[PDB]
Chains A and B, each alone.
Chain A
Amino acid sequence: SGVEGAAFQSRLPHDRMTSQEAACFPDIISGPQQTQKVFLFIRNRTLQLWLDNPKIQLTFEATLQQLEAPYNSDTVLVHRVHSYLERHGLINFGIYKRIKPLPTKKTGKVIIIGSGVSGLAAARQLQSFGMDVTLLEARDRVGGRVATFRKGNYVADLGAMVVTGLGGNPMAVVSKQVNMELAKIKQKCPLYEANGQAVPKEKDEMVEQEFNRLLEATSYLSHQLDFNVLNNKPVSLGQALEVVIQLQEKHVKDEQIEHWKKIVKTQEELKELLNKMVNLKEKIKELHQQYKEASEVKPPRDITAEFLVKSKHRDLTALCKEYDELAETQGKLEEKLQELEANPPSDVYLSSRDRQILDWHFANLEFANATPLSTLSLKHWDQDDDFEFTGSHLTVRNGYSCVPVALAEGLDIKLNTAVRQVRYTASGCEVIAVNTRSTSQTFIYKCDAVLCTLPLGVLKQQPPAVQFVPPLPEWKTSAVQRMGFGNLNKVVLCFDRVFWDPSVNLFGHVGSTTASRGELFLFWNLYKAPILLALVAGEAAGIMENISDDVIVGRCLAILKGIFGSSAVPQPKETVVSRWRADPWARGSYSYVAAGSSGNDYDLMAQPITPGPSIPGAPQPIPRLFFAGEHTIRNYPATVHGALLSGLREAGRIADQFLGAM
């Protein structure tokens, strides 16, 4: 297909028109299928071109020069296609050489709040579109949650270090434009219990299988058995796990109960028998005497007492037939009681040494979702799973900040400018920021449109860091109450001495409690230099924000002493510590689908706001206030790509309102 591989790489279906090309080719899609199949070629081709080299702008001339007829022919609709694609950031996004330099015919002022990837993406896009864009960032640097550390030759991302596959990832393109060295990450995760001695295969493997078995179990529990509201509260993922597990701890029991209750059916049968057998042995001891007695009466004899011997001799051989059957039929029953008493139903559901390792498999989950499983929606936590990329997960070896920074080249970024208030009305918008260094220094920005990349964390802040004037409508705010802003944090351990196993990327440590599963549950090297990251997840990470720096680097070194020995692990040349929920330009790490949220909230979060009319009776205005970043994009939350996609998007949306025609 190859041209269809560009559709895939552009997250579009090569064989059908999207609900959204339909948007603005409602002619083509209303009409005949030849026209559609051509449309699609042009679309996919035009993409393939951009992709096949994305470090230079692809003009309309360029796309036509490169189309052979019969597609070469409809010169107007090739323009139509190239323009849709150009706007909506499918081509000519990120970082390119511009064949056509920036016309200084600038057209509309947009204030964008925040130099996060969401922001910078829309910013560059809007400026590519010819538009006055200015960016207002509270921080002293760009990138936000794309945050990289650097002291000397040490370098390490303190947020956002993975590329969750290149297969239809926009960042694929970006990473070509910025030449970031990405490196794969090797499968192998050695778990080390509280002592310091590895878990073996056998066990390790056993529990993964169980973990996975257990999750699938929740999914059934949800979709099929329909366990989606225990007592007018939505159901946590964690809740369903506790239930699933519990039913596995039931059963295991009833299994035993049915086995021993199978033994008694036996033991008690063999008793009903041992009685028939003892009482026969009585009728026999006795009847025998009588036949000794009557046989004693020596002959000649009359026939009544010949008959007495004769008859008693039959009757005694009857009973010994009988009793002998009963002692075949006895070992038949002491047979059954070897079989049963020998191999029994299983003792336990989970060892406390296992339920402990299982806790680490959950901590890993709490990490990637950046929240306690207590909080994830059961119906919806995995809703982003249909859209996961192809390709191996990779890590940014050279520090992910290179990307934000790249994006920021050639943009008006006011740093240390902390928006305090956003006012928006029919006629335009006023943004009131302050200088972060002196809070007293007050700034006012007037514009046609505000784009808000303020983090969900921040949006949730009470009382509010930023004030909307007029306030955001109940529906939007409600969405914010609902969604989940989560948390994780990181310890960055810089050494001189590569003491872990070089061929090993990452290795767990198993916490002694459930409550403590998050604490330094994983360690990661991925950097040229001798750096290990210590990751903190779950209910844990929330608390470890309080514990002092030295204290955390304590337990860091402790569990490295365990895993590797006091001989081997130096003190560290340099240390650093996430602590994201406390950072006030973040209030956490990333979104999640809290129980009681759905993916719809992510769409509500994207929906722009349109003010009331200036003079009552006036015509319905246009929308003034827009929203981007990772909390807006239901198909790619909590990612860099998702952010960048949200930005690409709002830019297109904004252009269509303020420049409509291309």
Chain B
Amino acid sequence: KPPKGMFLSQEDVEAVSANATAATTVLRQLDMELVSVKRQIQNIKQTNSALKEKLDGGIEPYRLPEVIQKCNARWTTEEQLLAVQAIRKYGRDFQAISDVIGNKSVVQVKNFFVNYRRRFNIDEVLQEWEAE
């Protein structure tokens, strides 16, 4: 209804036109609520600027050089044993367990859980992972 770029609700109107002053209240106080923010901005620009000083370093010094170990389904007593222990640190997480061992596919790791499950009391290997 009002021409383009002109702003007027019986709300905004009735409020610049109660108390013979309450126009220069509303217009000349919002910019007080505006300055209060322009400072909160400043707080955080410093607060964050500080944390950005703590990250100069990156994590470049701490990156273990992750090599590809060409997968396998030869399930060594070596790897077999890591697996039980991994079950115990991890459970479910077929990925981590395979990430640990160095050759499965969550395929082959999902395969031990069940297949080798008979022989290594994996009941009591996951019953310790529900408690610690």
Chain A contact residues, CB within 8 Å of chain B:
213-214, 216-217, 220-221, 224-227, 230, 243-244, 246-251, 253-254, 256-257, 260-261, 263-264, 267-268, 270-271, 274-275, 277-278, 281, 284-285, 288, 291, 303-304, 306-307, 310-311, 313-314, 316-318, 320, 323
Within 8 A of A (CB), among B2-46: 2-3, 5-10, 12-13, 16-17, 23, 26-27, 30-31, 33-34, 37-38, 40-41, 44-45
- Interchain CB contact under 8 A, B96 and A247: no
B99 touches A317 (CB 8 A): yes
- Which residue in B2, B33, B78, B96 is a CB contact (below 8 Å) of A303? B78
Could you list 8 examples of A-B contacts with CB < 8 Å?
A243-B13, A244-B8, A257-B37, A260-B38, A274-B55, A281-B57, A303-B85, A316-B64
Evaluate contact between B63 and A251: CB separation under 8 angstroms. Answer: no
Q: Is B68 an interface residue when CB atoms closer than 8 A count as contact? A: no
Contact A267 B48 (CB under 8 A): yes
Bound Cα distance from A303 to B31, whole angstroms: 68
* Cβ–Cβ contact A244 & B6, under 8 A: yes
Say how far B115's CB is from chain A's closest CB, in angstroms.
20
A310 touches B100 (CB 8 A): yes
Chain B residues near A (Cβ < 8 Å): 1-3, 5-10, 12-13, 16-17, 23, 26-27, 30-31, 33-34, 37-38, 40-41, 44-45, 47-48, 51-52, 54-55, 57, 59, 62-64, 66, 78, 81-82, 85-86, 89, 96, 99-102
Are A303 and B62 interface neighbours, CB within 8 A? no
Task: Decide: A227 and B27 in contact? CB cutoff 8 A.
Answer: no
Q: A216-B3, A249-B27, A288-B64 provided; 13 other pairs, C-beta below 8 A?
A: A225-B10, A230-B17, A243-B23, A247-B8, A253-B27, A253-B31, A274-B55, A278-B55, A284-B62, A303-B78, A311-B86, A314-B96, A317-B66
Which residues from chain A contact B59 at a C-beta distance below 8 Å? 281, 284, 320, 323
**Would A213 and B12 be within 8 Å (CB), given that A253-B31, A254-B30, A311-B89 are in contact?**
no
What is the chain A residue whose CB lies nearest that of B29?
A: A253
Given the known interface contacts A216-B3, A220-B2, A314-B99, the answer about A257 and B82 at a Cβ–Cβ threshold of 8 Å is no
Q: Would A264 and B37 count as touching, CB distance under 8 A?
A: yes
Measured between beta carbons, the chain B residues less than 8 angstroms from A216 are 2-3, 6
A310's contact among B6, B48, B52, B101, by CB below 8 Å, is which?
B101
Bound form: Cα–Cα A581–B62 in Å: 91
Which residue of A220, A244, A260 contacts B1 across the interface (Cβ within 8 Å)? A220
Of all chain B residues, the one with the shortest Cβ separation from A324 is: B59
B3 to chain A, nearest CB (A): 5
Say whether B62 contacts A288, CB under 8 Å.
yes
Q: In the complex the two chains form, is A291's CB within 8 Å of B6's CB?
A: no
Q: How far is the CA of A264 from the CA of B36 in the complex (A)?
A: 12
CB distance from B22 to the nearest CB of A (A): 11
Say whether A274 contacts B52, CB under 8 Å: yes
Are A271 and B44 in touch, CB under 8 angstroms?
yes
A246 touches B85 (CB 8 A): no
Inter-chain CA distance A310–B98, complex, in Å, is 11
What is the CA–CA distance of A567 and B10 in the complex, to the nearest angstrom? 56
Structural contact, B85 and A307, CB atoms closer than 8 A: yes
Contact A270 B8 (CB under 8 A): no
In angstroms, Cα B27 to Cα A256, docked, is 13
- CB closest chain-A residue, reference B66: A317
Q: For residue B45, which residues in chain A have a CB less than 8 angstroms away from its CB?
A: 267
Q: Which of B38, B41, B78 has most A Cβ within 10 Å?
A: B41
Given A250-B30, A267-B45, A304:B85 Cβ within 8 A: yes
Residues of B contacting A257 with CB < 8 Å?
30, 33-34, 37
Q: Given the complex of chains A and B, what is the CA–CA distance between A254 and B57 in angstroms? A: 41
Interface pair A320/B48, CB less than 8 Å apart: no
Partner of B64, one of A250, A291, A303: A291
Q: How far is the CA of A568 from the CA of B71 in the complex (A)?
A: 98
B28 to chain A, nearest CB (A): 9
Query: Are A303 and B6 neighbours in the complex by a CB distance under 8 Å?
Result: no
Q: B44–A264 contact, CB under 8 A?
A: yes
CB closest residue in chain A, given B9: A225
* B125, chain A: closest CB distance, angstroms: 13
With contact pairs A224-B1, A225-B13, A250-B12 given, residues A260 and B6 touching in the complex (Cβ less than 8 Å): no
Is there an interface contact between A313 and B64, defined as CB atoms closer than 8 Å?
yes
The 5 closest A-B pairs by CB, nearest first: A274-B51, A267-B44, A251-B7, A288-B62, A253-B30
Chain B residues whose C-beta falls within 8 Å of the C-beta of A316 in the assembled complex? 62, 64
- The docked-state distance in angstroms from the alpha carbon of A260 to that of B35 is 10
Complex Cα distance, B16 from A254, in Å, reads: 14
Pick from A248, A303, A320 the residue with the most CB of B within 10 Å: A303
Pair A227/B17 contact, Cβ less than 8 Å? yes
User: Chain A residues near B51 (CB, 8 Å)?
Assistant: 271, 274-275, 277-278
Q: Which partner residue on chain B sits nearest A217 by CB separation? A: B6
User: CA of A261 to CA of B86 in the docked complex: distance in angstroms?
Assistant: 48
* In contact, B8 and A225 (Cβ under 8 angstroms): yes
Determine which residue in B6, B44, B48 has the highest number of CB atoms from chain A within 10 A of its CB, and name it: B6
**Shortest Cβ distance from B4 into chain A, in angstroms?**
8
Q: In the assembly, what is the distance between CA of A274 and CA of B47, in Å? A: 10
Residues of chain B contacted by A284 (CB below 8 angstroms): 59, 62
The interface residues of chain A lying within 8 Å CB-to-CB of B81 are 303, 307
Task: From known contacts A248-B7, A253-B34, A314-B99, infer whether A243 and B41 are also in contact, taking CB-CB under 8 Å.
Answer: no
A291 and chain B: residue at smallest CB distance: B64
Find the A residue at minimum CB distance from B78.
A303
For residue B49, which residue of chain A has the nearest CB?
A274
Q: Are A260 and B41 in contact (CB under 8 A)?
A: yes
**How far apart are the CA atoms of A313 and B30 in the complex, in Å?**
56
Please name all residues of chain B whose beta carbon is closer than 8 Å to the beta carbon of A251 when the two chains form the complex: 7, 12
Chain B nearest CB: distance from A251 CB in Å? Answer: 4
Determine whether the beta carbon of B47 is less than 8 Å from that of A271: yes
Selected from A217, A249, A267, A268, the residue in CB contact (under 8 A) with B8 is A217
